[PDB]
Amino acid sequence: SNAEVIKELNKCREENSMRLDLSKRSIHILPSSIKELTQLTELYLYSNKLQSLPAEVGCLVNLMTLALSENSLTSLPDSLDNLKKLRILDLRHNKLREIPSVVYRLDSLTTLYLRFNRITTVEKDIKNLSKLSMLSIRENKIKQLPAEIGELCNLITLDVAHNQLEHLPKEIGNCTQITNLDLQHNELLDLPDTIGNLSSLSRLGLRYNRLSAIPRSLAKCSALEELNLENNNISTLPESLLSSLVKLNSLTLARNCFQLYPVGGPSQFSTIYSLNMEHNRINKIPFGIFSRAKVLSKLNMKDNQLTSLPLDFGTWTSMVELNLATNQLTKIPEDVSGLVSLEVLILSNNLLKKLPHGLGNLRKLRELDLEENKLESLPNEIAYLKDLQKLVLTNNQLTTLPRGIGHLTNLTHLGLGENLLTHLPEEIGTLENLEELYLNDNPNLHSLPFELALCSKLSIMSIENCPLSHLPPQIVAGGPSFIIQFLKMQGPYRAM
Amino acid sequence: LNLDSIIGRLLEVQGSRPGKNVQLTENEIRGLCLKSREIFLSQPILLELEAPLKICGDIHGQYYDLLRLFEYGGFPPESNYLFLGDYVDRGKQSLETICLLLAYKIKYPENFFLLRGNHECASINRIYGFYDECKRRYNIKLWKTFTDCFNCLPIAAIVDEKIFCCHGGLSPDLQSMEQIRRIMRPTDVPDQGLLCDLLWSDPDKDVQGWGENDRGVSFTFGAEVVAKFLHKHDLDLICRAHQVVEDGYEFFAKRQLVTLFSAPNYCGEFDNAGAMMSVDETLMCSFQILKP
Amino acid sequence: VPSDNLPTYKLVVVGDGGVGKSALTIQFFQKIFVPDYDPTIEDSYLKHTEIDNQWAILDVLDTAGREEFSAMREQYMRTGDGFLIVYSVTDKASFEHVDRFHQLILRVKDRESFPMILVANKVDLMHLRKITREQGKEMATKHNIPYIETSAKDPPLNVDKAFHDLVRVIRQQ
Ligand SMILES: Nc1nc2c(ncn2[C@@H]2O[C@H](COP(=O)(O)OP(=O)(O)NP(=O)(O)O)[C@@H](O)[C@H]2O)c(=O)[nH]1
Ligand SMILES: [Mg+2]
Ligand SMILES: [Mn+2]
Ligand SMILES: [Mn+2]
């Protein structure tokens, strides 16, 4: 309401308040009487409909915060020149097609946010803003940065993610106080060797670019806590990169061009807790590669070219989560019994026809995903997986379940769809915690055991494309809730 | 990726009798998915586009009907395109349809745009055909590769500050455009909330405000909702799809909203024309009717 | 289908960097878990939802936890009707800093007490957990505020409950 706006403006000069909050008021045009309120040090105009700022704002010469996020601004008045104490300028979510020329003259600025505009260029005048400790210009259309970026020697955070950069000026190396360098989602073909000059660098966003290699000088950025190269064109790493990154907690090589593990042997993996190499073309895991990876607890090899596992994979005793999905494995060796700490084992989209007896020794296993294999049976020893909560067997060749399945009393999710099941064992009735049971697309499943009625927590059951011809047609046409009620009422457990 | 060769073979069957497949290799199609996926993520989830632009509604895998659309409108890059979703399911050649669209997206990424429809969703296109077609002609691994790609599609577009486009429609929760920008990708489509409603909701003339939707998902919204939305965000038009309309397109709320449907004689059950909307340099629209 | 003239509750999520404020918020609104870390400057979310059969509009403001991202945080907090104070159970320093955020809220709002819930996040990470449930209930009792454990990771734990309970605190004051 414009009535309220002018009312709040009078209140401000009446109280002589140093802060004016006009956010979220649907303001199209700011009244020129704001020129009166020269005591202001903070002015909040965010979340309005401003297309321009009146020149009278240049009269607010004591402002240290000018907050304009989420408007429709297409420029700024040259009168902002007078705001010689301005420290924070927030211009996110506007419609600027360039950094307004007056912003390049606001040399007192330390904090400048330009996210989500339409900017294509950063002028050499950016060197005027030499006191900037935070520059964010992500989500624009910038293709190049000027060499003058190197004159922002107080920069702590530089965020140029979500642009169209093909290169970084080598002068980035002169911004030696940078701890956050955000370059993800650009078109970067390389990094400058001067990136090693940023000895305080601790967060480096590189994912979704076009990198073919990482400079050896990155080894100097020994405060890096994560290295995430996801979605680039990288196939190797510089010789001593990873062992030099002594604080590395996580390494992501996903969606690159890897065919082999990076050379350097086991010491490269001594500090990381997680290794993600999904979506590459890696054809083997080297013998002994994790012999020094004492804290590595998560390994993701999904969607590679593995046809077998290394001979020592039973020694991966620190592993808690293991994803081998979408490879070409034909067997799992009996030595799997060594992974007694494993909690998540993802094996979907492989060529497995059977599972080893040693599977029964995975005493901590909580999730086992085997969808889209060729499994013709399950070993009797799966009955020993007492921690198991989720068992996914969708799209396999199963004809029966072992009766021992009923010993998995912590199971909540059982996926049996798209199999060859002719019946469910009566022992399913001791799955006291079962909540989701998927039976869809078992075309020779003509009946269900009355014991299914003892699964008191069952709330999702799918039975589409099961004939279930031994049940009344009206009941199976009514769907799972009718089937279960029928099993309760017509079976021996109705009183229960 | 041999992009021009893929496009050539996809266009080779132009003129032939409908139904004739195009046998791209598995590695070619997965390459289309991977390369378009990263381009989708390199661009905003709320696209800001400029006219001239041709806007098309549902295709639903009617590949030869899509080839006719490009004949009337001009094959890229002769014209710029925005499609509003629902490329797969129902039709007979979902694969050829999506592959050509992805190839054009990779080839002309600044001039060709694809929004997400409610069928660009694994839980939906598992049921209505695309999964079956994938498993028939290739394999499940490829279908899941498509899902990774669909999960990255943008959700809405605004053309020249004035035309707001999405597949489904408005949401009770949509109060500022930056809420759409805060939708993270890759993502599945949720059962309810903003992203659901943008892909699932429908206008309705008999509803005052918001009403429940016969589909069992999301909402209906009335003409007064449309008017207040346009006024709030200083827009002139909502362009959406998602509902088959007899004459290819249908105005709503005194032409403040248009429904576009580009799949003529949809499924075979409906005797409907398709249509596209051409937007010129001055935001003047024109509607081309596509005969069955 | 929401009702008509609903009240709006402005909920503000505060806490140290990396504790999961944004992952909780995004799980709550978009129903996914975002695994990659992107520091927040400021973001907001809005939904219509029914809590205890009363319809509400929840406007949720997600704030910066990293020091170098924290420009304007006081002003954004100043507009709140209630707060989630979030710490990570794997991050001792984030738990210690609960007192600082509790003090910041009362000073910004100029009140001796104010609707707030203590949120102990990332409890799915059993083997890294450093702050016990006991320490957490103790911190909450010290400040006389509710305590809740959450996980933004699938399957999410108590995410809707945390936000809905904060609205209850606001209503019930
Ligand atoms: N295991 C697990 N990880 C979580 C959980 N919540 C967040 N994370 C992860 O922890 C990291 C930080 O989460 P985020 O929500 O960005 O933290 P924040 O509090 O918003 N950080 P900031 O204050 O800088 O904006 C992300 O990698 C996120 O996926 C959780 O409940 N469990
Ligand atoms: Mg955050
Ligand atoms: Mn649709
Ligand atoms: Mn449709």
Residue numbers in the entry:
A (entry chain B): 86 to 581
B (entry chain C): 7 to 298
C (entry chain A): 6 to 178
What did the article's authors report about this structure?
A complex comprising the M173I rasopathy mutant of the SHOC2 LRR domain (80–582), GTPase-deficient MRAS(Q71R) and WT PP1Cα was isolated and crystalized, diffracting to 1.95 Å (Rcryst = 0.1838; Rfree = 0.2209). The holoenzyme exhibits a compact structure in which C-shaped SHOC2 wraps around both MRAS and PP1Cα, enabling reciprocal interactions between all three subunits. The MRAS GTPase adopts an active conformation, and clear density is observed in the structure for the bound GTP analogue. In the present structure, both SWI and SWII of MRAS interact extensively with SHOC2, while SWI, together with MRAS helix α1 and the adjacent regions, simultaneously engage PP1Cα. MRAS is engaged primarily by the descending loop and β-strands of LRR domains 2–10, whereas PP1Cα is coordinated by the ascending loops just C-terminal to the β-strand of each LRR spanning nearly the entire SHOC2 solenoid. PP1Cα binds to an extensive composite surface formed by SHOC2 and MRAS and is oriented such that its active site is exposed and fully accessible for substrate binding in the holoenzyme complex. The interactions between SHOC2 and PP1Cα are predominantly polar, and the binding interfaces among all three subunits contain a notable amount of ordered solvent. Similarly, the rasopathy-associated Q71R mutation in MRAS, which is expected to inhibit nucleotide hydrolysis and stabilize the active GTP-bound conformation, also resulted in an increase in affinity to the wild-type (WT) SHOC2 LRR domain (8×/3× binary/ternary).
The MRAS–SHOC2–PP1C holophosphatase dephosphorylates RAF at serine 259, resulting in the partial displacement of 14-3-3 and RAF–RAS association. SHOC2 is a leucine-rich-repeat (LRR) domain–containing scaffold protein of uncharacterized structure that is thought to localize protein phosphatase 1 catalytic subunit (PP1C) to the membrane and possibly provide substrate selectivity to this otherwise promiscuous enzyme. SHOC2 bridges PP1C and MRAS through its concave surface and enables reciprocal interactions between all three subunits. SHOC2 exhibits the expected LRR fold; the 20 repeats of SHOC2 coil to form a solenoid with an extended β-sheet along its inner, concave surface.
